[PDB]
Amino acid sequence: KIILNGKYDIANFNEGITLSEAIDGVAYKMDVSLVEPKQLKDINIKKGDKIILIDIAYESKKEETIFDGVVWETRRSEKSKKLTLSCRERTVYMEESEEQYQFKENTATQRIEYYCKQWNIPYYNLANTGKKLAKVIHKTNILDMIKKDLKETATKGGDLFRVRMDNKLKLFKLGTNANVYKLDSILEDANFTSSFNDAVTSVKVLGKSKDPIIGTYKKDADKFGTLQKIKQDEKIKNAKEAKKAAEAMFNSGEETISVDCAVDINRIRAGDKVSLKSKEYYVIDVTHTLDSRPKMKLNIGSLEYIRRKFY
Amino acid sequence: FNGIARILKENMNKSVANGTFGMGCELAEITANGLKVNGYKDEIQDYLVLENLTLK
């Protein structure tokens, strides 16, 4: 409804906005399509411009900044003067800037604070993930390093954390959204899919590092059969770490719902805890599309499958 | 569709490079700070050696 840019208000030009995020996505993504007459052409929107989308929030019905990022790419058509943007929050910067860091044994929160301090990234008070990580040397992107240590934190019994940018970097635990919205009331169509596609019933740990930690921790072998994996990570250097990694991998296969909603719940985001029918599910992916009729589509799943796949 | 192929090939190189990192023999030099391995930004202050290198 309001698109601030730097100074102007280009909400008087946009054909539609689509706010999309994935649980493992690089960044909260806003793809706003505009018509580009002389008026919009004058201001000369370039890549790197700062877009802030403001719309009436679902919670309190007050205008709140639902998106605050930067224009990552502009594509302009000439025959039809339709300028199209693809906005990203500043976690896209972290996913592109490579750097090598050597880390001793420590927790994920300390590592994230170290990254932010090194690269001068503003950040709120980061939640203590608690889990203690093994010494590693990293080379991938900063977001890649953060995701790697968060995955290793999900292993060893730690809670599932996800990093979202907003104005200043936030360490967002998955099941900690304020409002557990119920989608059954506006359920245009749902697609309950169940499978054994990524089911894990057994896991045979073969430790590449010593405390000779080896074991098997089959959990539902009698019911679904011995759907076995082999976890052979150097980071597992402990018997309890092996047991917790095994326990953080068992699941009954893929179990998700491809939900389609006729009303756009504005504040939904990846990782949020949302209800369909009596059950509760975590948002694997959300794709708003703020056309003339607000609309939302969701892909949600159980905790076990999400932990198995994305962690 | 060539853009998808190029992006996917970039992903091939990315994944292969990440997998090959931290593996295989590498050259190095000893310093007062500690071991200095070629291709590493920081010196390794804790490392192992073969026992035949510990001779008086």
């Binding site: 994935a22 493992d24 690089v26 | 992006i7 992903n11």
Partner: peptide
């Protein structure tokens, strides 16, 4: 009658490229 092919080839290319860039 024929522009559907161009439109939806563009949609397929955009969607797959978009997904690869996001997840990758």
């Amino acid at each position: 009658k024929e522009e559907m092919i161009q439109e939806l080839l563009s949609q397929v290319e955009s969607g797959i490229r978009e997904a690869l860039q996001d997840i990758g």
